[PDB]
Amino acid sequence: AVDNKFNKEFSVAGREIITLPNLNDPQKKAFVKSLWDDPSQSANLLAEAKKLNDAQAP
Amino acid sequence: KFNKELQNAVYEILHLPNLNEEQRNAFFQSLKDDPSQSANLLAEAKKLNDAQA
């Protein structure tokens, strides 16, 4: 049983999403829930959140 | 039955500024092992966060 340390990858990715200033509250919460459910996709999900954050810049 | 309490505790613990990543990892690992302690672990994380201001 390989343990990918996916929970620690969740905390690193979740911290990065919380610091994205242009996402709104439900957007951030949606990414966090997706990270928690499938932490194997932590890097893909952070990449999507950064794309969305950059697209919503003032 | 704790999907709201878990998601809330997870989201608030991520925001706590005074925690280190290892402490933050420990709470996440306990939440994944027993989500029924979401309120207790969140209260513990905030208390720990207040003591490390």
Author numbering:
A (entry chain B): 0 to 57
B (entry chain A): 4 to 56
Share the article's original sentences.
From the structures, we could verify clear compensatory changes between the residues showing the most significant covariations (13A-9B / 17A-31B) in both LL1 and LL2 library mutants.
Each Z-A mutant binds to its binding partner with nanomolar affinity (3.98 to 44.2 nM) but has minimal cross-reactivity with other monomers. The backbone structures of the three mutants are relatively similar (Cα r.m.s.d. of Z-A after aligning Z-B ranges from 0.447 Å to 0.641 Å). The other two mutants, LL2.c7 and c22, have clustered pi-pi and pi-cation interactions at the interface (Phe31A, Lys35A, Phe9B, and Trp35B). Additionally, the same compensatory mutations (positions 17A and 31B) as LL1 mutants are also seen from LL2.c7 and c22 mutants. For example, A-LILFK has more Z-B binding partners (B=77) than A-LIFFK (B=15) from the LL1 library, and A-LVLF (B=53) and A-VFLV (B=42) are also more cross-reactive than A-IVFF (B=3) from LL2 library sequence data.
